[PDB]
Amino acid sequence: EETRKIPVPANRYTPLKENWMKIFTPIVEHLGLQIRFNLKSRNVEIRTCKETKDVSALTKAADFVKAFILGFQVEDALALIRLDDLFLESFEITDVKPLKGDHLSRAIGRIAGKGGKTKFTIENVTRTRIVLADVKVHILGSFQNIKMARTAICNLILGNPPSKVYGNIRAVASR
């Protein structure tokens, strides 16, 4: 048999408990796969059985819960279950520019935008999903769409105003 283990942090335990139904039902129903929550090791254990076919689903199912570890919603990791070429790419905000303290916080605020609005725009334009961690940025989408959203995000922490990036990212998705 085959088995994968996924570590869950302490801040992700309560959403994992409160959303567990729609975690394990998409894995046991139409993937035919076994899962358990090992509380002692604080891990997600995913194992095959006699009821599974299309073996890559296992690996794909792994990415499913990994996305729900990294802060994505259940529906977007469900998209990782359904679609075939979906990817999650990750980088730190300081990986593009050295930002100290209040400048790093302001950079986060420009990526998020007022009311969240700006980040929603990029998702809604690029058909991606974006999780802003404490410092990390995770982008879930197809490779070209990740390239577009990553360029827009790096432009927001290029120092550019959110308005110019808003208009330009609405313009560039017409190709």
């Binding site: 529906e75 977007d76 469900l78 998209a79 359904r82 679609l83 979906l86 058909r127 879930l140 197809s142």
Partner: peptide
């Protein structure tokens, strides 16, 4: 969801549109 947006972005809207155009004794 992301899957729904991708599928609905690569498909075509269909259905709703109505055109108003145009015995016994």
């Amino acid at each position: 969801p992301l899957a729904d947006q991708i599928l609905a972005g690569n498909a075509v809207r269909a259905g709703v549109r109505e055109k108003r155009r145009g015995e016994e004794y």
